[PDB]
Amino acid sequence: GHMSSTPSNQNIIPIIKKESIVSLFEKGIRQDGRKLTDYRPLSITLDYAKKADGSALVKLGTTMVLAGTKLEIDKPYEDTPNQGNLIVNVELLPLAYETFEPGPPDENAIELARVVDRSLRDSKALDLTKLVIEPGKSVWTVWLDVYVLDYGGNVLDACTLASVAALYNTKVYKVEQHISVNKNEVVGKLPLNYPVVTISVAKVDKYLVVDPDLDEESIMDAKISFSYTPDLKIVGIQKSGKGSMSLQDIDQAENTARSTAVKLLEELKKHLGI
Amino acid sequence: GHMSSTPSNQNIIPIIKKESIVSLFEKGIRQDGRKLTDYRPLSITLDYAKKADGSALVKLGTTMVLAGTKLEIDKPYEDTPNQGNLIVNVELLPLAYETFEPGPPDENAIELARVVDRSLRDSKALDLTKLVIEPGKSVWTVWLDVYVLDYGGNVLDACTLASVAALYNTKVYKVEQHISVNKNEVVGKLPLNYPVVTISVAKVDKYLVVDPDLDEESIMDAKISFSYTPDLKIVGIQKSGKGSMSLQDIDQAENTARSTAVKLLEELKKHLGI
Amino acid sequence: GHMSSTPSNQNIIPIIKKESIVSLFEKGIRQDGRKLTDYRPLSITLDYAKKADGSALVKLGTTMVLAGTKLEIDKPYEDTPNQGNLIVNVELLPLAYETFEPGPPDENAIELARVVDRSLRDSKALDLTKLVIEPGKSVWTVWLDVYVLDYGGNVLDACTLASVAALYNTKVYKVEQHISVNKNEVVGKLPLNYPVVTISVAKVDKYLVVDPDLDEESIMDAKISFSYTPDLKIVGIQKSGKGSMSLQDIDQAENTARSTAVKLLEELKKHLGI
Amino acid sequence: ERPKLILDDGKRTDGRKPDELRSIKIELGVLKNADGSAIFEMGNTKAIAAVYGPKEMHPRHLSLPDRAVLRVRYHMTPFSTDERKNPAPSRREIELSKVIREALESAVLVELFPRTAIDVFTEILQADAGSRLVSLMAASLALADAGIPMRDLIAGVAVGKADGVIILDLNETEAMWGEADMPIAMMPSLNQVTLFQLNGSMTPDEFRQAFDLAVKGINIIYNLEREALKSKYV
Amino acid sequence: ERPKLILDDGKRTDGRKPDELRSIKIELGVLKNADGSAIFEMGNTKAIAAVYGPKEMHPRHLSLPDRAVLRVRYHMTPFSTDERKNPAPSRREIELSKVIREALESAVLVELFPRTAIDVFTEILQADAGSRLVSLMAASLALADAGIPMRDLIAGVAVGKADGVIILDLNETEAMWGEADMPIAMMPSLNQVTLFQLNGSMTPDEFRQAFDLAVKGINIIYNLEREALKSKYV
Amino acid sequence: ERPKLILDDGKRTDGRKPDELRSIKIELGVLKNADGSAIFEMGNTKAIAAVYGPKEMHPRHLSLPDRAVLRVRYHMTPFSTDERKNPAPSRREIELSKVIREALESAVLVELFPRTAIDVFTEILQADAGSRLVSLMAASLALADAGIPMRDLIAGVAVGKADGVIILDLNETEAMWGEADMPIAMMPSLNQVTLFQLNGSMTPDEFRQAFDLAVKGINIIYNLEREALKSKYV
Amino acid sequence: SQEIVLQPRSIVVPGELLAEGEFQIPWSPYILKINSKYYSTVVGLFDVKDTQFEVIPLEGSFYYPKINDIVIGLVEDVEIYGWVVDIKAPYKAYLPASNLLGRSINVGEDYLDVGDYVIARIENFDRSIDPVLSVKGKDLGRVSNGIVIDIMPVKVPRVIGNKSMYETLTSCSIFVANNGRIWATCSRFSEEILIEAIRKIENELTDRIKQFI
Amino acid sequence: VEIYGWVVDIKAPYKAYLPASNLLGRSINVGEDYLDVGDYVIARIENFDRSIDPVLSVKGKDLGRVSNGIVIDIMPVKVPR
RNA sequence: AAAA
RNA sequence: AAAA
RNA sequence: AAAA
Ligand code: NA
Ligand code: NA
Ligand code: NA
């Protein structure tokens, strides 16, 4: 049992503060001096968690996310006997924000894990049929755990970047028949078709904003996230937040999102080596 | 960990209201104009939940209960290698009454599931040895889920009626060896020996009342439920509520319960086709 | 999710009461008239729980603990294919103290179970490789459940005494191949190398005290527990409580603990028959 | 991906044209004890909702000083599906409870009742695709039936692509085996989207065609919600 | 259903006549820290209970304005049974916590202490049938020992049918393999039943014989509870 | 017990002498949103901590009238270890949350802020032995970085015996296969021990040698914590 | 024997010995006196006013309520007879409606609400109560115009000086609450003084910095 | 310790209250902070009934804080014996 | 379960 | 885990 | 799941 409730004690942001953040909106710039369509400074650090099979630490403005993978050997699901498994988790650590207490993932962490999961799974970036070992009897389970360490706005996009990066960074080990795993011997990297990005666009007033910071997220009517592969197919969409959005709003947001993705994808590819 | 506590914020029913409900008791009638020994209008709707293997929607006065079954294939319990399984659950949905919040079954839902379970199991209405497929290695598990949608008094009896009806309504599918289930091919109905009824008798003051409504349940000293098979063996008894009952009280209640069951059983048989 | 917090509504013990308990400290005696280095009256009752495979009821002053074992047959852990299993649980029943409400073990019960577990496991008193049946495929799992019934100070030591006693008291049954357990036929006792004791030493002011009662535990700066085998090897140490301890404090405590253990071990051996 | 979803006659597995809805059935005031109730059926997808009218939220530090708090539950019964679903809330059910709640948040004039809670409980009795939307619409109607003021009703429908054809109001087969599946909900009179998700994949152009087809389907559904509500009085 | 429960000598598997009780042993004030304590043994069935005297219930919205709230826990230790029981509360244990609580609710003069809670914790240390009743009686005695006023003590015993014979105070074998098993508890001086359940099956006549045998057994137990309590003072 | 932990050259599996530490690296103010933050690395053991400064604790019956309440979480990420750890708190993690909390309780001048809570969240990102201590030290530094007054910093190191040799700051291999493993933490300037445990076994003499080696290692670590903190200002 | 151990102006740290012996120092949360030793409790800066010493904290997001301090608060709630106010401390502050109204609350009455800033003074506070605020002062009460910058409360005296730092800045019309918050009204480009505050928390001079920017 | 008084354990089902105004014989002054946790206080019950918790009063001779001596606890039911 |  |  |  459990239900979703309207969040109560949130980041109450003063009236004057709102009025100011718009102000610069008229002129196409934000508090930090960026254009309504820019992402913040991006930083990616691979193999950051040394005992992960693959990891990436992602700094996006003040938002900070650490994605790590562990590969295990398993029986496959009966509904998918010719495919490895992908399991995505996101923890919003009480370390990220003053109001995140500890415990099992709230609807927020779960929604995050599921949106990333879908973007990954529905893009076919990770071909699960490639993770089979002896079909029907044993496959690889890719565990992707995503840890938000600093909550500074646009957590979803950063989780996606971190996830993709950790996957590309994943070392795979030789399997031995007798079926064990020799972790002394790396025999490759997880096979990915391509990267994927999620691009979140907040609606703040009459304005659409890419990659909202914390202050902006706390005054936004709603936001909408679009996931893209390099050929710029749409591979996931998710509206969130309490406000609604007009039809034209969503149309303009995807157009803007997609345009932003082109750049974000090049940037991500640079960081990943690909 | 967990403990049972005396319920706090309950349906506080005004003094004047109590005094009125008795009033008509002296003359052998209740608020709704029925005799101390009548059941309310009964309605049963089979195959109501289309994706259930068997279902029945039960309207008893304003109380509304939906029972559904799903059959699965399983290994048998080691303590019962020559028998299928029966698993009964009851949810008291927050939809039934203003004071039922969501979550895992409280003592009430659990007590309900267990009383129905016993009545079913101890009556031998469902012969579990009939649900075997290859003895010791595979049997049918009958999942009976019971959902109270409208809480209007005498929930237990209605759950029992719904349960029996859903069981009689259960479609069974052809099993294929290779051992799968072909759900394209119904090959029969769950085999039942007979129906069963539970008859709840509330003690309200100097009075015994069959099939209490909501108002009556909220002023009753206690209640006592007796389960019967068609030969009118007693196959389950459960006293509940905070009040006690004299020895003669219980004696007169079973006599009254049993008398009521005769009619209820005929009625149920009419609805079930049998 | 979950975190450790400083306990709030505890046994608030009046100022005057503290001042008194020290008083007699200057002269080497306590409230109950014992010397800073004495244990309270000890009582052990074996086979106390008749349906346990082995049990011991332990009365230490007013503190009361009941340890019981059940043996089962299992597959071994993969990290230990040539060894039986030991699983230790401690419940601090709401029956022990007014402020212990029911539920899953709090950090206290868990910490207790783990300290006993370690003392048992790290002493090698119970050789787990002796509990194998057919190596790699089936071993004995020793379930040790420890129930604190009366919380009167120094619960840890009493849990250890009870645990050891219950183990020594454990009956083992004949196994039958076909692999069943014939509980009609006891074929021996769990094989133990030797007993083990834990000796808790509280720091109260300038004073070190063996086997603190309830009042003393509620004014102690911290405590430190040392586990010994008969050869007086140290096989477990645990500091607990909010206060710190000087290096000399800990040095003197082990010296005192070890000295006490000699006596406690003889006493325990007397009770166990060994 | 395996079954043929569009047949040589150019129709769907249930005989529908790509621009055709499943039949709809609505019932109001079904639960005597709830302040508001509704059953919404869309083909084989069945949902019921109960609303428990604005009431002071006890905590009360969970309450809001300026508005009411919506509490919403999306849940599927164990027998609502082909194989029995465990009754414990899945990750999916948790997500959808939030998505549905957030949809309602744009509709329900919550500031009328500060410091209160309004409880919305929806159960999926039959799940043949689109249940989050059917659950949403039931909830919307139950609120209407409970007399809780709102900006508008919420209408919703899932669009998708199957075998390269953009299609309206997917049945379960189309959801499982199709290329994309995109539930959309609006307050149609205000032109406002309240629920928007896509799983699967589409070109940006497919997305725009699919979205335009969704609106047309939503207007038909909306008219129905409106009549349903007016029915007993007319 | 398999073992012979009544032997050719007409006695039971433990040698008892059908109208004979298992031996009883009671102990009071066993726990120094509890406001009230008791151990009740009935043959091989052993239970201990602790009571924590009326105390203001913190919540406090869980409290009652007119009376005290009873909080009760029935729980079996892992080693109380033949095979180790998991310590997590079973459905059965939850049911029995409620049934036992409701039994006590008719005994304990709760209106003396409004806005309070009285905690009753009972543990089953040895389970050879009838433990809910042994747990109940322990609880009753622990309340008495704690000086919490009551209408009466509660005495209880299970009756059943085995191989067609109505029998008194079933051992575990009779419960598992017998035809019916019917625990009954009363406040005997007031002629009031507090706990009543049947599992298995009986004709209405068997039910009446069984019930009459239960009362006679309960009177013997009641006398014992009464002496037990009076013992230390006499 | 199987691998050789001390080689014929008398050194350890990582080449260290028995009295040598793993390399240490500290970082402060890493999390913008926390009142205090730190990363502590000790060889391959990595931890991060965030502190959320004294704030009125809501309950408030959990608060203390005279002092602040410390709330502390020790937790290991699933990928912090060789095989994936389930993220649900283990018994071990629960114990260590308490042991670490109690260590801090002797350091943090809590009576300055009665009725408040101070939250300390530490995550293990890489676990190669000694993480409870690395977690502790991170926490200590995060408190320092947050300006929460303290008596002293906390320094800690595990000592052990491997193949009969007393050794300083064990790597994971030494912990798994060694004879004893004894984490110790102090407020070194005050000569006070805050965390003390031993698992494995030692003679009383070994215990005293091991303990003396631990202090010497702790003084080196302490100096580092002190410089780390002073670094940005100098 | 009486002696100070550290060179003044030193970088001090929790656990660090400052001086030995018997001094007569006003109790302070940043210094701990253990018998005849005195240690720092925080990352801070050692200092010696005349013959007394003190540790100046370099860290801390929190303000500590002092009776009669002037602070700028953020209304976070509305109670039946008053407002709950966030003055950036461990404890929340209260504002009695009677204080703001100078009279009792009238039947059916409903000045300040959530998201409002309020310059106020602390009329009441001690170890045993939450801070009560008062707006019955000149220039106190609701904040209409201007902006508000947040900074570490421990940094307020560094933005002040011998009133020095303040003068520099307004060359812009600012007000610096003890709260660790600063009211300002400048136009929007001039406002970018904000960047110069950030650099002060970044270096506990800037004159040059603002002439060129 | 509450804002205008003390919470007191008089060994009953209900906790007792002690108004600061009663102990002080006047209102509480601005910034003021006599009795604290662990203190014993001999007092009389100025108010109590089925519907309220006991309020204590120290405005009596020999009432108030307990400085010297000891305190023994016993069963209230044993006092007349 | 224990070990990290 | 994902899908309903 | 049921039985203790
Ligand atoms: Na949710
Ligand atoms: Na219960
Ligand atoms: Na813990």
For residue C85, which nucleotide's C1' is closest to its Cα?
I1
3-state DSSP helix/strand/coil % of chain D, to nearest 5: 30, 35, 35
Which chain F residues are Cβ-neighbours of A151 within 8 angstroms?
A: 33
G115 and A CB contact within 8 Å:
yes
Gap from A252 CA to I1 C1', Å: 56
The reply to whether residue C16 touches residue H37, judged by beta carbons under 8 angstroms, is no
**E140 phi and psi angles, rounded to 5 deg:** -55, -45
Residues found in chain H: 81
CB C85 within 8 A of CB C142: yes
CB C52 within 8 A of CB C166: yes
H1-68 placed in CATH 2.60.200.20: no
- C94: nearest CB among E48, E79, E121: E121
Which chain A residues are Cβ-neighbours of B103 within 8 angstroms?
A: 1-2
Structure-block tokens of residue B133: 């497929």
Which chain H residues are Cβ-neighbours of C13 within 8 angstroms?
A: 38
The reply to whether residue F50 touches residue A72, judged by beta carbons under 8 angstroms, is no
Residue in the block written with tokens 């640079």: A270
First to last CA, chain G: 54
Gap from A152 CA to I2 C1', Å: 39
Those nucleotides of strand K lying less than 7 Å from any protein Cβ are 1-4
Helix/strand/coil for A31: coil
Residues found in chain F: 234
Q: Which helix (H) or strand (E) holds F172?
A: helix F172-177
Q: Maximum distance among all alpha carbons in chain B?
A: 70
CA F103 to chain CA centroid, Å, is 9
**Residue of F233, F6, F37 whose CA lies nearest to F148:** F37
Residues 6+ apart with CB under 8 A from A177: none
Interface of H with C in 5-64 (CB under 8 A): 37-40
First to last CA, chain C: 45
F66 and H CB contact within 8 Å:
yes
CA B35 to chain CA centroid, Å, is 22
Write the residues followed by a gap in chain D (C–N more than 2.5 A). none
The reply to whether residue E56 touches residue H77, judged by beta carbons under 8 angstroms, is no
CB G137 within 8 A of CB G119: no
CB B60 within 8 A of CB B161: yes
- The CATH number of residue E179's host domain is 3.30.230.70
Alpha-carbon torsion, ordered G7, G12, G15, G20, to 10 deg? 20
- DSSP single-letter state for residue A77: P
Residue in the block written with tokens 């930083």: A43
Write the residues followed by a gap in chain A (C–N more than 2.5 A). 178
CB A236 within 8 A of CB A258: no
Nearest CA to the C1' of J1 belongs to which residue? Answer: A87
Q: How far is the CA of B120 from the centre of ligand 2 (A)?
A: 22
Cα H20 from Cα H24, distance rounded (Å) = 6
Query: What is the amino acid identity at position C15?
Result: I
Helix/strand/coil for C246: strand
Residue in chain A closest to G184 (alpha carbons) equals A16
User: How many other C-beta atoms are found inside a 10 Å radius of the C-beta of residue B88?
Assistant: 23
Cα C240 from Cα C234, distance rounded (Å) = 17
Cα B146 from Cα B116, distance rounded (Å) = 10
For residue D80, which nucleotide's C1' is closest to its Cα?
J4
Cα A260 from Cα A38, distance rounded (Å) = 8
> What sign does the CA torsion over A118, A124, A125, A130 have?
positive
**Residue of E108, E173, E170 whose CA lies nearest to E142:** E108
Query: What is the amino acid identity at position A213?
Result: D
Cα B100 from Cα G7, distance rounded (Å) = 69
The reply to whether residue C98 touches residue E78, judged by beta carbons under 8 angstroms, is no
| Helix spans in C169-227 (H) | 214-217
Alpha-carbon torsion, ordered E25, E27, E30, E35, to 10 deg? 130
* D60 cis-preceded (ω within 30 degrees of 0): yes
What's domain G1-56's architecture? Answer: Beta Barrel (2.40)
User: How many other C-beta atoms are found inside a 10 Å radius of the C-beta of residue B147?
Assistant: 27
Cα B253 from Cα B245, distance rounded (Å) = 10
Q: How far is the CA of G77 from the centre of ligand 3 (A)?
A: 33
Those nucleotides of strand J lying less than 7 Å from any protein Cβ are 1-4
CA F140 to chain CA centroid, Å, is 9
> What sign does the CA torsion over C162, C168, C174, C179 have?
positive
- F31: nearest CB among A49, A69, A150: A150
CA E160 to chain CA centroid, Å, is 16
Q: Where are the domains of chain G?
A: 1-56, 57-145, 146-213
Q: Which residues pair with G11 in a beta bridge?
A: G45
Q: How far is the CA of D97 from the centre of ligand 1 (A)?
A: 4
CB B171 within 8 A of CB B187: no
- DSSP single-letter state for residue G67: T
Structure-block tokens of residue B144: 């009976």
DSSP D123-158: EEEE-SS-HHHHHHHHHHHHHHHTT--BS---EEEE
Structure-block tokens of residue G212: 């060129």
Interface of F with A in 105-124 (CB under 8 A): 119, 121, 123
Cα F6 from Cα F13, distance rounded (Å) = 7
User: How many domains is chain F built from?
Assistant: 1
Query: What is the amino acid identity at position C86?
Result: L
The reply to whether residue H13 touches residue E55, judged by beta carbons under 8 angstroms, is yes
Does residue D9 form part of some domain?
A: no
**A124 phi and psi angles, rounded to 5 deg:** 65, 20
Q: Which residues pair with E37 in a beta bridge?
A: E50
Cα D1 from Cα D176, distance rounded (Å) = 9
Structure-block tokens of residue C193: 């190398």
What is the Cα Rg of chain F in Å?
18
Given 3.20.190.10, 2.60.40.1120, 3.30.1300.10, 2.40.50.140, which CATH number is that of G57-145? 2.40.50.140
Residues 6+ apart with CB under 8 A from A78: none
The reply to whether residue A236 touches residue D91, judged by beta carbons under 8 angstroms, is no
Q: Where are the beta strands (DSSP E) in D142-214?
A: 155-162, 165-168, 180-187, 192-200
Q: Which helix (H) or strand (E) holds A22?
A: helix A15-23
F191 and G CB contact within 8 Å:
no
- Nominal resolution in Å? 2.5
For residue A118, which nucleotide's C1' is closest to its Cα?
J2
Is beta strand E165-168 parallel, antiparallel or unpaired with respect to E116-126? unpaired
Q: Which helix (H) or strand (E) holds B60?
A: strand B54-60
Is beta strand E165-168 parallel, antiparallel or unpaired with respect to C85-92? unpaired
Helix/strand/coil for F139: helix
CB B188 within 8 A of CB B175: no
What value, to the nearest 5°, has the Cα angle with vertex C252 and ends C246 and C253? Answer: 90
Query: What is the amino acid identity at position G180?
Result: G
Write the residues followed by a gap in chain G (C–N more than 2.5 A). 110, 171, 186, 204
CB A140 within 8 A of CB A191: no
Q: Which of residues 157-186 of D touch strand J (CB under 7 A)?
A: 172, 175-176, 181
- DSSP single-letter state for residue B35: B
Angle between helices F91-105 and F131-145 (to 10 degrees): 40
DSSP A95-125: TS-TT---SS--HHHHHHHHHHHHHHHHHTS
CB F89 within 8 A of CB C105: no
For residue F83, which nucleotide's C1' is closest to its Cα?
I4
| Helix spans in G45-162 (H) | 97-101
Is E176 within 7 A of strand K by CB distance? yes
Nearest listed ligand to the Cα of residue F74: 3
Cα B67 from Cα B28, distance rounded (Å) = 33
Helix/strand/coil for F197: strand
Is D133 within 7 A of strand J by CB distance? no
**Residue of G200, G195, G198, G183 whose CA lies nearest to G148:** G183
Q: Which helix (H) or strand (E) holds G94?
A: strand G93-96
Nearest CA to the C1' of I3 belongs to which residue? Answer: F176
Which residue range is the domain that position E178 belongs to?
A: 19-234
- B89: nearest CB among D34, D81, D87: D87
Q: What's the CATH class of domain G146-213? A: alpha beta
DSSP E107-153: TB-GGGSTTEEEEEEEEEEE-SS-HHHHHHHHHHHHHHHTT--BS--
Cα G36 from Cα G40, distance rounded (Å) = 14
Do chains D and G have 3 or more beta-carbon pairs under 8 angstroms? yes
> What sign does the CA torsion over F52, F54, F55, F57 have?
positive
User: How many other C-beta atoms are found inside a 10 Å radius of the C-beta of residue E61?
Assistant: 8
Alpha-carbon torsion, ordered D141, D147, D153, D155, to 10 deg? -10
The reply to whether residue H31 touches residue G126, judged by beta carbons under 8 angstroms, is yes
Do chains C and D have 3 or more beta-carbon pairs under 8 angstroms? no
Structure-block tokens of residue F232: 């940005």
Nearest listed ligand to the Cα of residue D100: 1
CA distance C22 to chain H (A): 14
Angle between helices E204-231 and E131-145 (to 10 degrees): 30
Helix/strand/coil for A56: strand
Q: Which residues pair with B73 in a beta bridge?
A: B140
Residues found in chain B: 274
Q: Which residues pair with G70 in a beta bridge?
A: G121
User: How many other C-beta atoms are found inside a 10 Å radius of the C-beta of residue C127?
Assistant: 12
Is F82 within 7 A of strand I by CB distance? yes
User: How many other C-beta atoms are found inside a 10 Å radius of the C-beta of residue F153?
Assistant: 26
Cα F219 from Cα A57, distance rounded (Å) = 32
- DSSP single-letter state for residue E11: -
* Exp. method: X-ray
Nearest listed ligand to the Cα of residue D94: 1
Gap from E178 CA to I1 C1', Å: 38
Structure-block tokens of residue F234: 């100098």
- DSSP single-letter state for residue E86: P
Residue in the block written with tokens 């357990």: C181
Query: What is the amino acid identity at position B5?
Result: S
**Residue of B169, B139, B195, B186 whose CA lies nearest to B68:** B169
Gap from B144 CA to J1 C1', Å: 26
Q: Which residues pair with G49 in a beta bridge?
A: G52
Residues found in chain E: 234
Q: Which residues pair with B59 in a beta bridge?
A: B43, B64
Is C126 within 7 A of strand I by CB distance? no
The reply to whether residue G115 touches residue A15, judged by beta carbons under 8 angstroms, is yes
For residue C86, which nucleotide's C1' is closest to its Cα?
I1
Which chain B residues are Cβ-neighbours of A2 within 8 angstroms?
A: 102-103
Residues 6+ apart with CB under 8 A from B171: B53, B54, B186, B188, B189
DSSP E141-201: HHHHHTT--BS---EEEEEEEETTEEEES--HHHHHHSSEEEEEEEEGGGTEEEEEEEEE-
Cα D164 from Cα D173, distance rounded (Å) = 15
For residue E129, which nucleotide's C1' is closest to its Cα?
K4
| Helix spans in F27-149 (H) | 91-105, 131-145
CB C241 within 8 A of CB C221: yes
Cα C240 from Cα G5, distance rounded (Å) = 35
DSSP A170-203: -EEEEEE---EEEEEEEEEE--BS---EEEEEEE
* A40 cis-preceded (ω within 30 degrees of 0): no
Gap from A47 CA to J2 C1', Å: 28
Cα H29 from Cα G67, distance rounded (Å) = 13
Which chain A residues are Cβ-neighbours of C3 within 8 angstroms?
A: 102
Residues 6+ apart with CB under 8 A from C61: C32, C40, C41, C152, C153, C154, C211, C213
CA distance A96 to chain D (A): 21
Q: Judging by beta carbons within 10 Å of its beta carbon (0-12, 13-18, 19+), is residue B25 exposed, middle or buried?
A: middle
Residue in the block written with tokens 């049946």: C133
Domains of chain A and CATH, by start: 14-274 (3.30.230.70)
Which chain H residues are Cβ-neighbours of C20 within 8 angstroms?
A: 70
Structure-block tokens of residue D26: 């609505």
Which chain E residues are Cβ-neighbours of H51 within 8 angstroms?
A: 114
